[PDB]
Amino acid sequence: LDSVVYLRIYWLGLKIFTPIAVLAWAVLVPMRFWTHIVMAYAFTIWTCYVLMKEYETIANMRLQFVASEARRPDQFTVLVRNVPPDADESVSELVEHFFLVNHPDHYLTHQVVCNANKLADLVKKKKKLQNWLDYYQLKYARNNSQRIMVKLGFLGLWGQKVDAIEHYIAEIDKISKEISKEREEVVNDPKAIMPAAFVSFKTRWAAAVCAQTQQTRNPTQWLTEWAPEPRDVFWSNLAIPYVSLTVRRLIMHVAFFFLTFFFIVPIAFVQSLATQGFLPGIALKLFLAFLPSILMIMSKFEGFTSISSLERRAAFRYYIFNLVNVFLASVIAGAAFEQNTGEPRIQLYFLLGLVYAAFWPDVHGRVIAALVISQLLLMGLLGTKHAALAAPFLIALPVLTIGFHHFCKGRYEPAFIRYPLQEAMMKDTLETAREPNLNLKGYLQNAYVHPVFK
Amino acid sequence: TLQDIGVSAGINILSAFVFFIIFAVLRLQPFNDRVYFSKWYLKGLRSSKFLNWMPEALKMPEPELIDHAGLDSVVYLRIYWLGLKIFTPIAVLAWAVLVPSMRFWTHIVMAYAFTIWTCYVLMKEYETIANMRLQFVASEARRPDQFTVLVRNVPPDADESVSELVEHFFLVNHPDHYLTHQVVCNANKLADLVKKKKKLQNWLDYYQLKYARNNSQRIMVKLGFLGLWGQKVDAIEHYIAEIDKISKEISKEREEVVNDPKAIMPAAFVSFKTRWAAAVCAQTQQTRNPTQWLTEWAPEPRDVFWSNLAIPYVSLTVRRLIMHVAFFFLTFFFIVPIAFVQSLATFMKSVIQGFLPGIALKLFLAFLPSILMIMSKFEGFTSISSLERRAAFRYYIFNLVNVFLASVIAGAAFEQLPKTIGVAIPMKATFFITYIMVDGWAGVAGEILMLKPLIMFHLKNAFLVKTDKDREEAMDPGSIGFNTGEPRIQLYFLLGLVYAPVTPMLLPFILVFFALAYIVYRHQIINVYNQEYESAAAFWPDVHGRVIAALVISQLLLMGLLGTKHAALAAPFLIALPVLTIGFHHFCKGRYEPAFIRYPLQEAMMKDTLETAREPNLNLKGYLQNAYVHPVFK
């Protein structure tokens, strides 16, 4: 806000000047390594202190900035995931019994997610295949080309697809009544339901309590969490087989790091040379790809349940990849030759112009990421000296920055929690005073059904 | 040199058997039964071949042992069994492969197999301990800390006192569950004076009994040997006057501390009608402001470190940084004695020159746990269990730096009279075998004698006991000693993992230490060693983290050692081990550590429902309202 505007004037100067100086002055002028390391430490501690002060100011602005919205579902609901299956009771009965025993006199109702897995699959192929047929007919009118992947690539149906219009229309008509009979089945079927649910409480207090606590002696079951907006929930990931989200996120770190390291390799070989046979040209044509969307899909292959979170994670990965390759390699090549939508765009424009001359915690994460990348790549640049033996004393700098980041985590992030207990209770009391004749149950028991299900 | 190893092995086995002979003699003597059997007295269960105790300590399975001692003791005893499980197949595999290109890949596959086995054993053990903890807590008896939460950093106010603030807040924000609260009172001075009066009473009793021994006049001038030139020609009248004046000061202090409002600290122990409500208050963000109304589970009153509840919460970070700096200076200015003991490692004459470094090092580190506990009390932690785990962490870092790397570096340098670590490490296998033997076998077999508590008990009984029914006061067996017992075994883990692929002759010494220490400590836990606090084995995440750190250090050192060979090609294999090990650490962390850091609400509700169905006429408020006052105020 106002403080962000005030501090950005001093902030931009340091931001443009911190990587360029370390790139140029460190290789241009030869007390050599001592000066280099001491200047690096001075800059990194200056940045750390600036972040800490600014982030105290932002936290205080948050505390004074307390205001109200009207009300919404996900102000009362949580997303109980990975409900354990039982042969004797359906998911609805299990959820109801659990939340009547272990959270009594606050639980209101639960809306179990329908077995949308095949449902979401069929809806998604429905939409993408009508779109597919549309622009492919347009393309065939423009450029008559034949595809060799009929919607599956590997193990598609043994058909002909001479028309692909009437056959698909008939399949859609049949699957409509198939969906109808499945709808009739799910109301009494104990296996046509995914293991997840949206649980609604009488109060914000209860939902906050239920979102922050452990629910069972098995931290992989009844895995509770703040529910998204009914428009914002990503219906596919609700019932991932849950192969240990911790493992699922570790795999993402590793795969992303190898992806970026692999993409560094061609540029490294190009710089080393400039210091089958024709397939490299096709590869260079392909390196301009939709890869942003590739990362988005790649994390979508993992589970976050909310479109906002998926977009945030994809944007962060794309940010770090951009800042590494299209910035640091570019500026090092330039040095060798010498010898919240408008905000990221204006960042890119200001960086490009200077080449020739609760979102704030995310911003903090990005700045810390930039500092860590700078430090690690300077590490790689300077490690060429054999038998330096300065490493067990010089390596600590990324570790120190990560320690400071965790200090900031534990010291200021808890100021952006949704509904700490005091606020939830105060909102409850005020709302009850304002609207003492509110049938809350009727209001909150119709959302989180499905976009398809009316 | 193997001859020195054999001679020292003979000497240390001789010392162990001499210790056990002396122990079997002392144990049967009726006039010190109150020492070797100190528990069975604190339970009120007792009153008034020479190695039969070695198998006799193997009765009492883990269920009955858990009931007799506690879960902290039984888990800390499982640490030695963990050592045996990790290092017996490692020892067998190394002795069947690495003892009489190609041997390069043999080494690499050895490192991979050792890490895989270690991680599998850690996973199984950490599951077992998690379930043991959950079962124990579910079955535990009622304690006031199951309902109580320590609220620190209450915000100050112009007119309302601290108690009114706390009551209003927990009435508004936890209705139908908030029961009572007890404020924290800064009574350090009063407690100090009470302790001083106790010391003076001890001296007075000593002198009174001495006078009753011989009819004369004592002349002890204020220090015994070289104090102020007093006479205290009575030396009993002087202490009578001292006790009277200290009692007057105590009475005035008691009157003052109750009515002074600056003696109230901004903290309170708030209690709830149910375990579920306490768990809700102790795990949830209370207010927006991240520093005000901080809540966490409270320690049971026999656990609180009352001296440190009177520290303004703003200054804990300053204190922690100051003690980090002082710990750096300690781990630095302590390089000198270790370089000295390594100088000491320059026919029965020379073998004792191979045996004396162990005792020298053991003697220089004997006063280290006391220093580390003082530094831990400086960063006020408000709980004996937290102080002990903090001190164990610090003393592990101290071992890993000074006892291990400083010894390796200093010894390599002193043999001087790139990566030289590849010859600096395997040359200290002799020193570390000798140190393991001295500080392990002989040290443990000497602990079972309990010389220090035995001597203190006899001294107190001969000089300070005035009547009957006060001996149980002198009986102070102590605890299992996490601070000291745990980092030693962590160091032996680290040595065994580092030297297993390098020189596999280190391991049998460690295995003998693990079996011996297991027997000895099981006997002691059964028979002596009262327990000062009772967490439910909450230290185990720390033990697991430290074993993972030892694995990573071992792997890095191996990579540095074999990085000397031309055309290494080890990086695509030994940069995968620390990464796979850290990934495994994070999987175990996320899957099993919640049992140790969080309290599930279903567990609390089950406990509460069973309790109410069992004892429906319980008056909780009477049980909770007077705990957590202070031991000084009656």
Side-chain angles (χ1 to χ4, degrees), chain A residues 1-141 153 156 159 162-454, chain B residues 1-212 224 227 230 233-634:
Chain A
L1 270 299
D2 281 342
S3 295
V4 169
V5 165
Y6 292 165
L7 277 296
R8 285 302 62 60
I9 292 173
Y10 271 93
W11 183 256
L12 304 171
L14 188 153
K15 299 290 94 176
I16 296 89
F17 289 118
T18 190
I20 293 163
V22 182
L23 174 70
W25 182 88
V27 72
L28 273 167
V29 186
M31 50 66 78
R32 189 182 204 165
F33 291 9
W34 292 279
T35 317
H36 287 80
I37 299 300
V38 73
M39 283 316 287
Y41 269 85
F43 291 166
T44 191
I45 297 169
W46 188 241
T47 55
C48 286
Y49 170 80
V50 171
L51 288 178
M52 175 270 258
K53 196 157 66 63
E54 207 282 342
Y55 192 61
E56 281 216 11
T57 53
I58 298 313
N60 277 22
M61 171 85 158
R62 186 54 172 88
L63 296 188
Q64 293 144 120
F65 186 73
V66 293
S68 77
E69 65 273 16
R71 76 197 182 199
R72 260 187 292 128
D74 65 358
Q75 280 176 348
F76 301 80
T77 73
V78 297
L79 183 58
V80 163
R81 296 177 67 189
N82 202 7
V83 159
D86 187 336
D88 291 331
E89 293 83 3
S90 67
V91 174
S92 180
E93 296 145 328
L94 270 173
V95 175
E96 186 181 7
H97 187 262
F98 186 97
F99 275 93
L100 265 173
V101 170
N102 291 288
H103 283 269
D105 210 330
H106 270 308
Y107 149 79
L108 197 66
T109 190
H110 76 295
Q111 183 66 41
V112 64
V113 61
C114 182
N115 192 1
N117 55 6
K118 180 67 174 66
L119 187 153
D121 284 332
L122 60 83
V123 177
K124 80 191 298 292
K125 56 191 81 68
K126 177 68 67 67
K127 208 73 178 67
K128 68 93 176 179
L129 277 176
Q130 54 92 24
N131 291 344
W132 215 265
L133 281 177
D134 198 3
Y135 65 92
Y136 204 78
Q137 288 179 357
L138 296 171
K139 163 99 188 184
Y140 177 81
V162 173
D163 190 54
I165 290 162
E166 184 58 30
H167 162 69
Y168 265 120
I169 278 168
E171 268 298 307
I172 290 166
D173 192 63
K174 183 188 178 182
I175 205 170
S176 183
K177 71 97 178 179
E178 265 195 338
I179 287 167
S180 297
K181 68 181 178 67
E182 294 174 352
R183 279 201 205 151
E184 294 169 356
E185 289 168 350
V186 299
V187 298
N188 293 317
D189 187 75
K191 84 183 77 65
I193 292 309
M194 294 183 287
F198 297 90
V199 185
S200 301
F201 302 99
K202 277 148 181 217
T203 60
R204 284 78 176 272
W205 195 94
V209 167
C210 185
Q212 309 180 68
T213 53
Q214 182 98 320
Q215 295 301 136
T216 306
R217 66 198 278 145
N218 183 354
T220 311
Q221 294 180 339
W222 299 99
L223 173 79
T224 186
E225 163 195 317
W226 270 114
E229 294 293 328
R231 65 179 176 88
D232 204 334
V233 61
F234 181 73
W235 292 90
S236 308
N237 276 127
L238 288 192
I240 193 66
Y242 200 77
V243 185
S244 171
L245 197 149
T246 48
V247 181
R248 285 183 174 272
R249 294 301 105 84
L250 287 163
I251 293 168
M252 294 299 291
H253 295 285
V254 176
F256 155 84
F257 170 78
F258 290 168
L259 182 62
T260 195
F261 174 75
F262 181 76
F263 184 89
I264 297 169
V265 170
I267 288 172
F269 292 167
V270 168
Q271 291 311 124
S272 180
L273 293 172
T275 195
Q276 190 58 51
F278 185 60
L279 269 177
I282 294 155
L284 272 295
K285 191 185 187 293
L286 297 173
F287 300 134
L288 314 190
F290 300 102
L291 188 150
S293 293
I294 294 171
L295 285 199
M296 171 145 188
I297 289 299
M298 163 64 193
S299 170
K300 201 196 274 194
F301 189 61
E302 305 321 287
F304 280 163
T305 68
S306 52
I307 290 172
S308 177
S309 299
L310 280 193
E311 273 177 14
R312 204 262 311 270
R313 171 50 59 97
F316 182 80
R317 290 196 181 288
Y318 168 64
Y319 178 78
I320 188 171
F321 182 76
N322 209 18
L323 183 63
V324 166
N325 297 261
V326 192
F327 211 95
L328 188 150
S330 174
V331 297
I332 198 168
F337 274 121
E338 287 159 358
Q339 318 169 15
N340 292 342
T341 62
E343 195 54 38
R345 187 175 61 200
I346 193 166
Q347 300 280 326
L348 311 173
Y349 283 161
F350 268 107
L351 308 179
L352 187 56
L354 274 297
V355 172
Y356 193 71
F359 77 112
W360 177 263
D362 303 296
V363 172
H364 172 102
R366 287 189 190 97
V367 159
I368 285 299
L371 260 53
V372 166
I373 300 299
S374 172
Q375 293 179 357
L376 291 203
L377 271 193
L378 269 295
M379 282 315 208
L381 179 67
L382 189 149
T384 66
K385 176 179 179 291
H386 186 279
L389 310 177
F393 304 101
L394 192 152
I395 290 183
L397 183 62
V399 176
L400 262 173
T401 55
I402 292 311
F404 165 79
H405 174 62
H406 279 195
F407 170 85
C408 284
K409 205 45 53 193
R411 173 62 175 74
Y412 305 106
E413 294 293 328
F416 304 108
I417 282 292
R418 184 141 160 241
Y419 288 133
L421 290 190
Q422 197 206 37
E423 284 203 347
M425 188 88 198
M426 182 179 72
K427 259 74 164 177
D428 287 3
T429 289
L430 275 296
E431 157 195 325
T432 292
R434 263 219 315 271
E435 306 154 44
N437 290 318
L438 167 63
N439 176 31
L440 189 88
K441 181 162 186 170
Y443 161 50
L444 291 173
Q445 63 85 29
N446 293 114
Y448 303 95
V449 176
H450 209 305
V452 166
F453 266 53
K454 174 49 209 71
Chain B
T1 66
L2 181 163
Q3 284 86 10
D4 291 331
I5 300 299
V7 163
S8 289
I11 293 308
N12 280 40
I13 293 183
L14 204 64
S15 287
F17 276 19
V18 159
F19 284 153
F20 291 163
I21 286 299
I22 287 176
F23 165 59
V25 165
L26 287 174
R27 196 164 66 120
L28 304 180
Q29 296 298 289
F31 65 109
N32 47 26
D33 192 68
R34 187 96 52 165
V35 173
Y36 291 110
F37 286 127
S38 177
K39 188 176 262 285
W40 306 108
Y41 275 75
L42 293 163
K43 297 200 89 72
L45 270 61
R46 170 185 281 246
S47 191
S48 164
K49 255 282 191 183
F50 63 91
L51 294 188
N52 291 320
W53 66 263
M54 262 200 194
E56 173 87 350
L58 272 295
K59 307 297 187 291
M60 272 205 58
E62 289 180 352
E64 212 187 311
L65 187 62
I66 281 180
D67 274 352
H68 185 76
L71 189 72
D72 293 335
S73 301
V74 168
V75 165
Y76 168 84
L77 203 62
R78 283 185 67 84
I79 295 176
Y80 296 95
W81 175 240
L82 175 78
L84 271 166
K85 276 189 289 183
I86 286 181
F87 293 108
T88 304
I90 284 184
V92 161
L93 193 74
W95 270 88
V97 169
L98 272 62
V99 171
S101 66
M102 166 56 109
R103 193 175 167 178
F104 181 76
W105 294 124
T106 297
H107 272 317
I108 302 300
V109 163
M110 274 315 108
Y112 263 84
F114 296 170
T115 294
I116 283 175
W117 175 252
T118 304
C119 286
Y120 165 77
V121 168
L122 280 178
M123 182 179 72
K124 278 289 191 176
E125 191 75 18
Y126 185 66
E127 173 195 11
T128 292
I129 296 298
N131 299 345
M132 268 169 71
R133 188 178 194 270
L134 287 176
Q135 199 62 58
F136 182 84
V137 180
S139 299
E140 210 168 59
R142 170 166 71 256
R143 307 186 317 181
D145 63 357
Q146 294 168 8
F147 314 81
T148 288
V149 168
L150 167 63
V151 171
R152 323 212 50 200
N153 210 39
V154 181
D157 192 286
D159 63 358
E160 271 176 310
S161 65
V162 166
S163 183
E164 317 287 3
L165 269 160
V166 174
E167 196 196 22
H168 183 46
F169 182 99
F170 281 80
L171 266 174
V172 172
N173 299 274
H174 282 76
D176 291 331
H177 278 321
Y178 156 81
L179 186 59
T180 194
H181 79 297
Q182 187 77 72
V183 176
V184 164
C185 195
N186 187 319
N188 284 5
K189 184 179 290 293
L190 180 60
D192 263 358
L193 272 68
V194 167
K195 198 142 53 53
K196 193 177 310 305
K197 188 184 192 280
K198 182 62 65 68
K199 196 157 308 308
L200 266 294
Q201 191 75 8
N202 273 37
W203 280 107
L204 172 44
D205 287 296
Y206 163 54
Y207 278 150
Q208 279 194 313
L209 283 176
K210 204 201 184 140
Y211 182 90
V233 177
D234 198 71
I236 290 179
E237 188 66 25
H238 154 70
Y239 279 165
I240 292 297
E242 273 289 352
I243 282 186
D244 282 28
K245 75 152 301 193
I246 194 63
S247 178
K248 184 172 320 312
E249 197 161 26
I250 294 170
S251 296
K252 176 251 280 183
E253 188 59 66
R254 279 180 181 278
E255 294 294 328
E256 181 143 318
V257 66
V258 176
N259 294 17
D260 169 68
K262 324 322 162 303
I264 288 295
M265 310 295 316
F269 291 91
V270 286
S271 285
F272 300 89
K273 294 181 176 67
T274 47
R275 293 169 186 75
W276 184 92
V280 160
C281 175
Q283 297 178 61
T284 57
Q285 179 81 31
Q286 278 302 119
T287 60
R288 298 293 296 163
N289 194 327
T291 189
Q292 295 181 341
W293 303 97
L294 296 149
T295 56
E296 81 259 13
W297 287 106
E300 50 169 334
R302 79 168 166 167
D303 199 356
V304 189
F305 195 67
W306 299 99
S307 305
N308 281 131
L309 278 175
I311 283 179
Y313 175 84
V314 64
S315 86
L316 290 193
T317 303
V318 162
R319 274 166 181 244
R320 265 190 261 291
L321 268 288
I322 284 174
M323 281 315 188
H324 279 315
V325 163
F327 175 68
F328 171 98
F329 273 20
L330 165 64
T331 198
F332 182 76
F333 274 19
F334 210 101
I335 285 282
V336 185
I338 276 159
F340 173 51
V341 69
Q342 285 287 34
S343 82
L344 271 173
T346 191
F347 56 97
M348 291 315 78
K349 315 299 184 181
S350 64
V351 299
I352 302 301
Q353 197 72 38
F355 181 76
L356 186 138
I359 295 170
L361 190 55
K362 188 174 177 59
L363 201 78
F364 283 120
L365 309 177
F367 284 151
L368 209 47
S370 294
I371 292 166
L372 291 179
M373 200 75 157
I374 289 186
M375 284 161 56
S376 305
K377 293 175 176 171
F378 194 74
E379 316 161 352
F381 263 114
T382 62
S383 184
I384 302 173
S385 64
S386 295
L387 292 178
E388 288 192 350
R389 286 156 67 205
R390 174 60 149 186
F393 170 70
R394 286 197 188 292
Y395 183 68
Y396 171 69
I397 283 179
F398 182 103
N399 275 350
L400 186 152
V401 171
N402 282 6
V403 173
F404 170 73
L405 291 175
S407 294
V408 165
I409 287 305
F414 273 30
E415 271 181 355
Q416 280 190 348
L417 305 170
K419 297 177 184 180
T420 56
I421 193 66
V423 295
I425 280 181
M427 289 285 108
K428 309 311 287 183
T430 295
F431 170 77
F432 282 132
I433 285 173
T434 287
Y435 182 50
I436 283 174
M437 271 175 27
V438 174
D439 187 66
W441 309 1
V444 164
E447 293 180 354
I448 209 174
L449 282 167
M450 311 216 78
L451 280 193
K452 181 182 180 299
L454 168 63
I455 279 177
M456 281 205 318
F457 170 81
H458 278 327
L459 267 287
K460 288 183 186 181
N461 189 359
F463 291 170
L464 301 203
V465 173
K466 276 283 203 69
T467 176
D468 200 0
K469 307 301 176 279
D470 63 358
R471 281 151 61 83
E472 69 275 16
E473 296 171 342
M475 182 179 72
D476 62 358
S479 77
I480 193 66
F482 194 75
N483 319 322
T484 62
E486 156 69 12
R488 173 171 66 206
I489 190 167
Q490 289 301 346
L491 169 64
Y492 292 11
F493 268 67
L494 165 66
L495 294 181
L497 277 165
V498 160
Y499 284 75
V502 167
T503 180
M505 212 195 78
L506 183 66
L507 290 182
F509 302 101
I510 291 173
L511 298 178
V512 164
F513 161 70
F514 285 148
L516 183 61
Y518 185 90
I519 301 299
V520 164
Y521 279 105
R522 190 176 165 100
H523 172 267
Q524 291 221 306
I525 279 165
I526 282 179
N527 272 314
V528 306
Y529 280 175
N530 206 17
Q531 215 175 339
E532 280 174 345
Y533 56 89
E534 172 70 18
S535 178
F539 52 76
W540 184 269
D542 306 338
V543 181
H544 175 88
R546 278 198 264 292
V547 181
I548 289 290
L551 270 172
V552 163
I553 303 288
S554 177
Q555 296 175 357
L556 290 189
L557 291 197
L558 173 85
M559 171 215 78
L561 199 166
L562 290 192
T564 66
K565 177 175 180 286
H566 184 278
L569 303 177
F573 287 93
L574 282 71
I575 301 299
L577 283 175
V579 175
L580 286 175
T581 297
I582 292 298
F584 164 79
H585 172 51
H586 271 283
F587 159 74
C588 288
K589 187 174 181 180
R591 163 79 178 90
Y592 299 106
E593 189 182 45
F596 293 94
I597 56 172
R598 327 199 70 197
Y599 196 37
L601 300 187
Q602 184 202 43
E603 292 290 327
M605 181 55 88
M606 281 214 287
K607 183 86 160 295
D608 273 5
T609 294
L610 274 71
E611 159 163 54
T612 297
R614 190 152 21 81
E615 292 176 276
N617 274 337
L618 182 62
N619 184 4
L620 264 180
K621 189 171 174 66
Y623 177 65
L624 299 160
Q625 71 176 357
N626 267 341
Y628 290 121
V629 178
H630 202 283
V632 173
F633 306 114
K634 274 292 261 193

